[PDB]
Scaffold this active site. Structure first.
Site, short mmCIF file in Angstrom:
data_model
loop_
_atom_site.label_atom_id
_atom_site.label_comp_id
_atom_site.label_asym_id
_atom_site.label_seq_id
_atom_site.Cartn_x
_atom_site.Cartn_y
_atom_site.Cartn_z
N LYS A 14 -60.52 -65.05 -70.31
CA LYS A 14 -59.10 -64.72 -70.36
C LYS A 14 -58.35 -65.36 -69.19
O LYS A 14 -58.46 -64.91 -68.06
CB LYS A 14 -58.89 -63.21 -70.33
CG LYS A 14 -57.43 -62.81 -70.35
CD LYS A 14 -57.23 -61.33 -70.63
CE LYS A 14 -55.75 -61.02 -70.85
NZ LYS A 14 -55.52 -59.63 -71.35
N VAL A 18 -59.48 -66.35 -74.51
CA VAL A 18 -60.37 -67.30 -75.18
C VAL A 18 -61.45 -66.54 -75.93
O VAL A 18 -62.00 -65.57 -75.43
CB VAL A 18 -61.07 -68.25 -74.19
CG1 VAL A 18 -61.94 -69.23 -74.96
CG2 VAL A 18 -60.03 -69.00 -73.36
N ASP A 120 -54.95 -75.35 -60.35
CA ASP A 120 -55.61 -74.05 -60.49
C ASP A 120 -57.14 -74.08 -60.35
O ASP A 120 -57.86 -73.43 -61.10
CB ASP A 120 -55.21 -73.41 -61.81
CG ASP A 120 -55.49 -71.92 -61.83
OD1 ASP A 120 -55.48 -71.31 -60.74
OD2 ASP A 120 -55.69 -71.36 -62.92
O1 609 Z 1 -59.44 -74.40 -70.68
C1 609 Z 1 -59.41 -73.16 -70.78
O2 609 Z 1 -58.36 -72.49 -70.67
C2 609 Z 1 -60.72 -72.40 -70.98
C3 609 Z 1 -60.85 -71.12 -70.43
C4 609 Z 1 -62.04 -70.42 -70.57
C5 609 Z 1 -63.10 -70.99 -71.27
C6 609 Z 1 -62.98 -72.26 -71.82
C7 609 Z 1 -61.79 -72.96 -71.67
C8 609 Z 1 -61.67 -74.23 -72.22
C9 609 Z 1 -62.74 -74.81 -72.90
C10 609 Z 1 -63.93 -74.10 -73.04
C11 609 Z 1 -64.05 -72.83 -72.50
C12 609 Z 1 -65.24 -72.14 -72.64
O3 609 Z 1 -66.18 -72.63 -73.27
N1 609 Z 1 -65.37 -70.86 -72.07
C13 609 Z 1 -66.44 -69.97 -71.95
C14 609 Z 1 -67.76 -70.02 -72.37
C15 609 Z 1 -68.63 -68.99 -72.04
C16 609 Z 1 -68.17 -67.91 -71.30
C17 609 Z 1 -66.84 -67.86 -70.88
C18 609 Z 1 -65.98 -68.90 -71.20
N2 609 Z 1 -64.70 -69.11 -70.89
C19 609 Z 1 -64.30 -70.28 -71.38
#
Ligand code: 609
Length: 256
Positions: A14, A18, A120
């Site tokens: 989050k 996501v 960030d």
């Molecule tokens: O680019 C983004 O905003 C983004 C944010 C979070 C995730 C992701 C984001 C962008 C691309 C992929 C992910 C992602 O695979 N994960 C996770 C996988 C396993 C456990 C927690 C995860 N959180 C994300």
């Protein structure tokens, strides 16, 4: 639960949230970023569509419907999640930190080359993939610039990782690359100490601390003197003299 070819599953991370998503007719898992319409989001998308590097997440598709209030961005899944959570009583060992920091450097170098300031960088935005390497995630607040650097005035990102030159009470202009380096410094600090170097539950105080508090090192855990030097250089409160990425790349602790 069903977005065309995608079957939304549980939440895994989050702005927005996501979720794990299953892609039928492909039989593969993806990461679905779900946003409720309530132009920045399209800038993030634009920035993402331009990035292709092993240490950066990869956007796969966008599902936007003028009728629907929700917008969906599907990314390739970075299965192992956040490299670490902050705070934590179980920091990483130096060797672990160096390993990950090397990925972070490669990724940042690439982003700056592509004229992108992440804005960030923090441990929770560095996901560990199948091969054990880091991928920079969450470009929801990043900027694109023309020229040699970005000249910014807005204050965005995560409080504890914000650079002092971005916290003036007068809305002054500041460099973008140095902002990411400062965030990489706070991040390396978190890597081995398990918590941020500047804390305070009162925003204005935190700002004052980020801007005035001298960097202090807990005598425990014990870390090599070269690492303390690297961190001290990356956390140089003066942007003009703060170590640049080309130098970090060649620092004793990093190449060690
Ligand atoms: O680019 C983004 O905003 C983004 C944010 C979070 C995730 C992701 C984001 C962008 C691309 C992929 C992910 C992602 O695979 N994960 C996770 C996988 C396993 C456990 C927690 C995860 N959180 C994300």
């Amino acid at each position: 639960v069903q977005l065309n070819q995608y079957t939304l599953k549980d939440e895994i991370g989050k702005y927005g949230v996501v979720k794990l998503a299953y892609n039928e007719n492909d039989n593969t898992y993806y990461a679905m970023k779900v946003l409720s319409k309530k132009e920045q989001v399209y800038q993030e998308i634009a920035i993402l569509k331009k990035l292709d590097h092993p240490n950066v997440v990869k956007l796969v598709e966008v599902l936007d419907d003028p009728n629907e209030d929700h917008l969906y961005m599907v990314f390739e899944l970075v299965n192992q999640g956040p490299v670490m959570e902050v705070p934590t009583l179980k920091p990483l060992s130096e060797d672990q930190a160096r390993f990950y920091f090397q990925d972070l450097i490669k990724g940042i170098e690439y982003l700056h080359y592509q004229k992108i300031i992440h804005r960030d960088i923090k441990p929770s935005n560095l996901l560990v993939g199948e091969d054990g390497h880091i991928k920079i995630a969450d470009f929801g607040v990043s900027n694109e610039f023309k020229g040699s650097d970005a000249l910014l005035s807005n204050t965005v990102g995560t409080p504890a990782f914000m650079a002092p030159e971005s916290l003036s009470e007068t809305r002054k202009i500041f460099s973008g690359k140095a902002l990411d380096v400062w965030a990489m410094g706070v991040t390396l600090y978190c890597f081995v100490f398990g918590q941020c170097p500047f804390m305070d539950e009162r925003i204005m105080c935190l700002h004052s601390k980020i801007k005035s508090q001298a960097l202090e090192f807990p005598d425990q855990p014990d870390i090599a003197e070269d690492l303390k030097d690297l961190i001290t250089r990356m956390l140089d409160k003066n942007p003009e003299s703060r170590i640049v990425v080309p130098e970090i790349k060649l620092h004793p602790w990093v190449t060690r």
